Design a protein around this ligand. Structure first.
Ligand SMILES: CC[C@@H]([C@H](C)O)n1ncn(-c2ccc(N3CCN(c4ccc(OC[C@@H]5CC[C@@](Cn6cncn6)(c6ccc(F)cc6F)O5)cc4)CC3)cc2)c1=O
Ligand code: HEM
Length: 442
């Protein structure tokens, strides 16, 4: 009564290679050949069970940690975030920590993000896109805007002086590269590891200097930044976060937002600039050609409904995180099947977002589409572990789109839209394809 396995033919290596080259075509094949949305594969002799039937998402996102656990599956992050941070911490602390973070997105806070976001976007553009026309690599530039823009929202002035975006990005890169996606399924002292520690330590040292400089300061002077937020925070037992933990959280917050948003921004701009999608590009300008130079939280939140769809449909068609997993601590029901204890249960936004019923014509970028199966869209996950940076990411991306398409027009050099590059653990467009020509207006 367990879900149908997929033929192996190579015990030394599971479906690893097939999945790595193209996991969409591969997964759809499985789900197609076995006549079942729920199926099990073997990655290096380890049963990975995939809930690929959107109707059955709740069976994956609903179970509590005691039954379904991410900790063992997400071990690989521990080196990046810290030896005692989320997924490296007992869930009670983990959850506890993640909440502090969430309280940093009170949207009591967004009040000042729009002006900041636009301040960095306009600056970058007026710094890199000067000429009346020119060629840039969209993916690399959005990455710059993302990090730059994110720091201008969460990092205080004093911190940004010591740690600027350009520099912070290098640190993330240094440690995030330490990551081998394969490990997640298959549990070293590589040059990548070393760089990762130093980078986080460096970041550590600095954050230590700033705090010291803040605590010596007295006694007022207005809205505290992310770090300050984390520093104030106190546990359920009544103890303040250790810096090592505090650092980890910041890495986490920044790490998680860097690629997912960078990619989402890119895909969005790509589709939107494509001549085939003139329909929606126009519909977009129709929505932003009314806004003033200085945008405010209100109009980005409440006055850009079609732009949100653009971002959502981007994440829908090409989800940055193609799947999420958990260790099955106890046998869990799923459809007519049963997932045995020991399995790595996983749910794939990539797969689900391409189910014919939930999203007819999956490969078609349609911003006005809606899930034909409730719960089908899981770009930001769901249940207890539903993404926390959603509201922020969306705000961050939407505002960028508004500032970019307002002052520049774009043109995709390549005939069609970039192919997804499935080799990175966070998935976006290839970037050997992202070459774009911009044209300043007036
Ligand atoms: C073929 C051999 C080789 C050759 C080259 O082909 N090859 N080629 C290609 N692949 C290959 C490629 C990819 C993969 N992976 C397997 C690992 N998967 C994976 C996905 C997500 C993941 O995330 C862990 C948590 C998820 C939530 C999040 C991130 N987050 C949330 N919001 C913002 N960020 C998070 C949450 C809370 C938080 F607080 C912080 C957080 F970060 O981190 C962990 C792992 C991805 C696919 C495997 C192999 C190869 O092996
Ligand atoms: C498009 C942008 C983002 C996407 C697509 C995204 C996607 C996700 C997904 C799919 C998950 C579920 C992970 C899992 O189920 O295993 C998740 C969780 C999470 N993400 Fe995001 N996320 C995004 C942005 C962010 C940002 C900006 C942050 C930080 C501010 C962030 C922080 C988190 C956190 C804290 C969780 C909770 C993980 C947990 O509770 O265990 N995410 N995100």
């Amino acid at each position: 009564k367990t879900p149908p396995v997929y033929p192996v033919t190579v015990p030394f290596l599971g479906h690893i290679v097939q999945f790595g080259k193209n996991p969409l075509e591969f997964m759809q094949r499985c789900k197609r050949d076995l006549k079942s949305g729920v199926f099990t594969i073997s990655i290096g002799g380890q049963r990975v069970t995939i809930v690929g039937d959107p109707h059955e998402h709740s069976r994956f996102f609903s179970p509590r940690n005691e039954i379904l656990s991410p900790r063992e599956v997400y071990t690989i992050m521990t080196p990046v975030f810290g030896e005692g941070v989320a997924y490296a911490a007992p869930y009670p602390r983990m959850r506890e920590q993640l909440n502090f973070l969430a309280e940093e997105l009170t949207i009591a806070k967004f009040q000042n993000f729009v002006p900041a976001i636009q301040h960095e976007v306009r600056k970058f553009m007026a710094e890199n896109w000067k000429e009346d026309e020119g060629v840039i690599n969209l993916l690399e530039d959005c990455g710059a805007m993302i990090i730059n823009t994110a720091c201008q929202c969460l990092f205080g002035e004093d911190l940004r002086k010591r740690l600027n975006a350009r520099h912070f990005a290098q640190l993330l890169s240094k440690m995030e590269s330490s990551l081998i996606p394969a490990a997640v399924f298959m549990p070293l002292p590589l040059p990548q590891s070393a760089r990762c520690r130093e980078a986080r330590a460096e970041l550590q040292k600095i954050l230590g200097e700033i705090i010291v400089a803040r605590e010596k300061e007295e006694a007022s002077k207005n809205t505290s930044d992310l770090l300050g937020g984390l520093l104030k925070a106190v546990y359920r037992d009544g103890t303040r976060m250790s810096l090592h933990e505090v650092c980890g959280m910041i890495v986490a917050a920044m790490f998680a937002g860097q690629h997912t948003s960078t990619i989402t921004t890119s895909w969005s701009m790509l589709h939107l600039m494509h001549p085939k999608n003139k329909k929606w590009l126009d519909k977009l300008h129709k929505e932003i050609d009314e806004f003033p130079a200085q945008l405010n939280y209100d109009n980005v939140m409440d006055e850009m409904p079609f732009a949100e769809r653009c971002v959502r449909e981007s994440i829908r068609r090409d989800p940055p995180l193609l799947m999420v997993m958990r260790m099955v601590k106890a046998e869990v029901k799923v459809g007519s099947y049963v997932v045995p204890k020991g399995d790595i249960i996983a749910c794939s936004p990539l797969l689900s977002h391409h189910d014919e019923e939930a999203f007819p014509n999956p490969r078609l970028w349609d911003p006005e589409r809606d899930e034909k199966v409730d719960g089908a869209f899981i770009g930001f996950g769901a249940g207890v572990h539903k993404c926390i940076g959603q509201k922020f990411a969306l705000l961050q991306v939407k505002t960028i789109l508004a500032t970019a398409f307002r002052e520049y027009d774009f043109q995709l050099l390549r005939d069609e839209v970039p192919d997804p590059d499935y080799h990175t653990m966070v998935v976006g467009p290839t970037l050997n394809q992202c070459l774009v020509k911009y044209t300043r207006k007036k």
